[PDB]
Design an enzyme around this catalytic site. Structure first.
Site, short mmCIF file in Angstrom:
data_model
loop_
_atom_site.label_atom_id
_atom_site.label_comp_id
_atom_site.label_asym_id
_atom_site.label_seq_id
_atom_site.Cartn_x
_atom_site.Cartn_y
_atom_site.Cartn_z
CG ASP A 1 -5.78 -0.82 3.80
OD1 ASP A 1 -6.50 -0.47 2.85
OD2 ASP A 1 -5.06 -1.84 3.77
CD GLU B 1 3.27 -1.43 8.31
OE1 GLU B 1 3.21 -0.86 7.19
OE2 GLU B 1 3.71 -2.59 8.45
CD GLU C 1 0.80 -6.88 7.63
OE1 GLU C 1 0.03 -7.04 8.61
OE2 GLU C 1 1.16 -7.83 6.90
CG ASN C 2 -4.90 -3.05 7.38
OD1 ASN C 2 -4.84 -2.05 6.67
ND2 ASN C 2 -5.24 -4.24 6.92
CG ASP D 1 -6.78 -6.83 3.90
OD1 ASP D 1 -6.43 -7.99 4.23
OD2 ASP D 1 -6.08 -6.09 3.19
CE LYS E 1 -3.14 -6.06 5.13
NZ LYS E 1 -2.04 -5.97 4.14
CG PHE F 1 -4.47 0.55 -7.24
CD1 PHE F 1 -4.69 -0.67 -6.61
CD2 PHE F 1 -4.50 0.61 -8.62
CE1 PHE F 1 -4.96 -1.80 -7.35
CE2 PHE F 1 -4.76 -0.53 -9.37
CZ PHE F 1 -4.99 -1.73 -8.73
CB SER G 1 -5.06 9.99 11.85
OG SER G 1 -6.27 10.61 12.28
CB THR H 1 -3.27 -10.27 4.04
OG1 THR H 1 -3.25 -8.87 3.76
CG2 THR H 1 -1.83 -10.79 4.09
#
Ligand SMILES: Nc1nc(-c2ccc3c(N)[nH]nc3c2)cc(N2CCOCC2)n1
Length: 277
Positions: free
Chosen positions: A151, A94, A137-138, A133, A135, A21, A88, A164
């Site tokens: 996130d 990542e 990636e976050n 969540d 991870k 989204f 930021s 995830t």
């Protein structure tokens, strides 16, 4: 406070991230030449999909956070079709990128980056907030190579959803119920992943992954720092109430006092020079 900013205030550039989204775009504000990571959300799609609560929760949470290990929401605005969040800009991207690049971390880097994540979590949890969540990636890396966690739409604010698959805690697969321990479980996975180079629960598909999780079906490579392994074992515990760092275990005191963190100075992590990767 300054005037409400607008799209024309910025020179947009490359895409930094993409979600179901939203899209994150690098933008330079013209009057200041500052770089921001602008998160762009299409209103129609959010409404059509019932995500308004998630967008709202993120805005409300990322405004309430004031700590160096968290990406910051500096401003918001909208035009006819879109919402804009000015975030930021974590130039180095990542943490996942680095796990892949270098394969797996040595003890010193594992120790430093684990302590930063612990310290961030302690702050987050102190405000009665759960990420849900967490991870690689976050977990973003600033230009100075300190973490900035981002996130937050799926966070919960302590007085429904599954993150995830590989980092999902057992209680989510057995009750639809989350808490700080859920973040601590994820922490256990992430540590395992820094040391071993891979996440502890891997399988052909999500069902199988979930199968391993509830069974606690994973194991340690032979080359796994013993103290890191001991810590991971005290985090990846089926019973959420017996996870090092959670309130039933008396919180972050005993967690930060784990032998694996022996050489850590907790008070000024963000002022320390990260170990080179
Ligand atoms: N809050 C939030 N931040 C980011 C994000 C991504 C890269 C960033 C960077 N390089 N600096 N700042 C950044 C913020 C993405 C995101 N999306 C993307 C994936 O879908 C889930 C939600 N949400």
């Amino acid at each position: 406070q300054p005037r409400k900013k607008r799209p024309e205030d910025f020179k947009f550039g490359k895409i930094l991230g993409e979600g179901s989204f939203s899209t994150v775009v690098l933008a330079r504000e013209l009057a200041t030449s500052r770089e921001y990571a602008i998160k762009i959300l299409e209103k129609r799609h959010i409404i059509k999909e019932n995500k308004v609560p998630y967008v709202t929760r993120e805005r409300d949470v990322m405004s309430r956070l004031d700590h160096p290990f968290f990406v910051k929401l500096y401003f918001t605005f909208q035009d006819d079709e879109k919402l804009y969040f000015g975030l930021s800009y974590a130039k180095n991207g990542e943490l996942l990128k680095y796990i892949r690049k270098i394969g797996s971390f040595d003890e010193t880097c594992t120790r430093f980056y684990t302590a930063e994540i612990v310290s961030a979590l302690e702050y987050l949890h102190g405000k009665g907030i759960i990420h849900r969540d967490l991870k690689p990636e976050n977990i973003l890396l600033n230009e100075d190579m300190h973490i900035q966690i981002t996130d937050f739409g799926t966070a919960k604010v302590l007085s429904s959803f599954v993150g995830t698959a590989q980092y999902v805690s057992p209680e989510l697969l057995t009750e639809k119920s989350a808490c700080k321990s859920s973040d601590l479980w994820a922490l256990g996975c992430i540590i395992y992943q820094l040391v071993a180079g891979l996440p502890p629960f891997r399988a052909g598909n999500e069902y199988l992954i979930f199968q391993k999780i509830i069974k606690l079906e994973y194991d340690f490579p032979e080359k796994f720092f013993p103290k890191a392994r001991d810590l991971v074992e005290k985090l990846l515990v089926l019973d959420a109430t017996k996870r090092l760092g959670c309130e039933e275990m008396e919180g972050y005191g005993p967690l930060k006092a784990h032998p694996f963190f022996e050489s850590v100075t907790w008070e000024n992590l963000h002022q320390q020079t990260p170990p080179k990767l």
